[PDB]
Design a protein around this ligand. Structure first.
Ligand SMILES: CCCCOC(=O)c1ccc(O)cc1
Ligand SMILES: CCCCOC(=O)c1ccc(O)cc1
Lengths: 9, 233, 242, 9
């Protein structure tokens, strides 16, 4: 999910 | 052990004040359903990127597992957008300041179907905050409380609850600091927290509206906004 | 008004005195149940509870001070939250179960019966667990339930007149806050603990609002599916929410 | 409204 990636970025 | 719990009230306030995201602008084009909803979802999408980076800076939040961080934001994102909107609109009685260059009123809500109702709720919350003379420092505590609280029961948990208590302590701290009597402190704490119930209600209604709007395939929605929406099943 | 003249002890007394009864369902462990009967038990029960709730509301300090139109509005907004909090309160001593009625204790499993009622069940159980974790007292419970009645529709109400209606509610609300604090102080909580617990209790109201909203949509869904019977009062309450 | 009625009676 995009949120997962953004939370990690 | 989370660093959040060791912070003093003043450090908590400053951390939150410092994490605040910016006020974004909408289009500089000087209203249909498609056009209004297009601006709002565009704005929302941009605000979400800032919110995700704001949340990582709320003390205690990064100590949670990624999965829990996702859960909380998924549950709370619309509530957070809404309380921010309400806060921005506070000094503008009768208007919703979506952006500095997008300051709307009830009449324009009529243009989108099922929007004036949400608009009227938002406006009343704004008025309520204004009449209570809500302070920026109280606002940021309330906003972080929403982030940690909204998804907490659809769940570590102790951690979230310990951090929630820390934010309570911080609120009272601010009210004592502003010179409020004991009774005024607890009454004001209650008043503010009860508004969070109304914010939940508005989010639930906004989510339904967003869903129908999605189904009506009227305005395109970013993959991000669609994922945040889909999380509410 | 008598409302704003009540001491904390008198307020607790009033609220305790006004508690409605616990009703029985029509459940029969020997009878086979479908989705449309299990749910029918719950809606039959809710309908009967509503009648008692209306009469309980009249005995909540401040409530009959309001115009009839405003009473109607508050109950239309709050009814399902009030039913839900009562259910969670009854279910406190039954981990993993919802005590809809003394003869109707339900498991998450049995809750799958209705299409999608599972999520709502889980939310109610989480709340019940939360009440257990906090060791919620009956005195605190009646305060919260009256808060819901007075608070939930207060921001969805004409004139600078109809604004004084809203202001009386805020005064009563503050009085209930005072009562909660008084209860905690007598329980020996420090001031920091009092404030923390007050917040913990009030934040639960947000989750109750959420559950009510979710239940309201499942209810509307059931209506349209027209397979499970719904009473006229329940139908009218539903409609108030659109 | 039934509710309105019951609130009077
Ligand atoms: C779905 C009805 C409008 C809900 O609010 C918004 O879409 C919105 C967008 C950006 C904000 O900062 C706040 C609310
Ligand atoms: C839409 C229904 C959700 C589950 O709750 C109930 O049906 C219910 C019925 C009576 C109560 O006292 C509490 C809940």
């Amino acid at each position: 999910k995009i949120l997962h990636r953004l939370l990690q970025e | 052990n989370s660093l959040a719990l060791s912070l003093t009230a003043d450090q908590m306030v400053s951390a939150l004040l410092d994490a605040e995201p910016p006020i974004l602008y909408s289009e500089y084009d000087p209203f249909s359903e498609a056009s209004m909803m297009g601006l709002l979802t565009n704005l929302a999408d941009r605000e979400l990127v800032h919110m995700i980076n704001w949340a990582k800076r709320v003390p205690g939040f990064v100590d949670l597992t990624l999965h829990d961080q996702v859960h909380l934001l998924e549950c709370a994102w619309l509530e957070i957008l809404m309380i921010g909107l309400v806060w921005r609109s506070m000094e503008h009685p009768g208007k919703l300041l979506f952006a500095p260059n997008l300051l709307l009123d009830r009449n324009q809500g009529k243009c989108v179907e099922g929007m004036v109702e949400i608009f009227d709720m938002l406006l009343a919350t704004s008025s309520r905050f204004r009449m209570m003379n809500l302070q920026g420092e109280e606002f940021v505590c309330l906003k972080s409380i929403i982030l940690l609280n909204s998804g907490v029961y659809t769940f570590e948990k102790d951690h979230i609850h310990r951090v929630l208590d820390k934010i309570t302590d911080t609120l009272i701290h601010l009210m004592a600091k502003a010179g409020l009597t004991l009774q005024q402190q607890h009454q004001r704490l209650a008043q503010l927290l009860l508004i969070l119930s109304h914010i939940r209600h508005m989010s639930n209604k906004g989510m339904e509206h967003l869903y129908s709007m999605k189904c009506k395939n009227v305005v395109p929605l970013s993959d991000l906004l669609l994922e945040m929406l889909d999380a509410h099943r």
